[PDB]
C-alpha cells in the first residue's frame, strides 16, 4: 500500500521504502536551497538489511577510502568497520 509520509520517522520493515535528503546544513530553510547541502538517503523497496548494506557500501567505502588515503581523521577504521558491516549485512 502506497504510504508516503514526509516525517522524521525512519522506519523499515520487509519492503518499507523511503526518500530523504538528510541536510548537511540540518536547518532545511526556504531562503536558500534546502535540497542543495543534503546527503540524501533514499531507502529502496528491498529488504532493510540489504538496503542498509548497499547504502553503507555506497556511502562509506570510497568516501572513507579517499579520506583515509588523504586528509575527518578516523577514516581508516571507519572504512574497516563500514566494509565489515556492509559485508556482514549482505
Amino acid at each position: 500500500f502506497i504510504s508516503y509520509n514526509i516525517n522524521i520517522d525512519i522506519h523499515y520493515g520487509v519492503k518499507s521504502n523511503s526518500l530523504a535528503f538528510i541536510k548537511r546544513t540540518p536547518v532545511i530553510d526556504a531562503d536558500k536551497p534546502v535540497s542543495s547541502q543534503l546527503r540524501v538517503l533514499t531507502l529502496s523497496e528491498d529488504s532493510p538489511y540489504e538496503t542498509l548494506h548497499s547504502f553503507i557500501s555506497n556511502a562509506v567505502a570510497p568516501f572513507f577510502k579517499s579520506y583515509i588515503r588523504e586528509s575527518d581523521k578516523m577514516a581508516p577504521s571507519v572504512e574497516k568497520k563500514i566494509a565489515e558491516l556492509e559485508m556482514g549485512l549482505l
Partner: peptide, 29 residues
C-alpha cells in the same frame, strides 16, 4: 530562528523529490 522551509516550501520540495527518489523522475506524484 526562523530560516526554515515553509509548509508549502518543504511540502513542494518533498513532493518534487519523493518521485525522483521513488520512481524514474518526474514531478510530484
Amino acid at each position: 530562528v526562523q530560516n526554515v522551509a515553509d509548509v508549502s516550501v518543504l511540502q513542494k520540495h518533498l513532493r518534487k523529490l519523493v518521485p525522483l527518489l521513488l520512481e524514474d523522475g518526474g514531478e510530484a506524484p
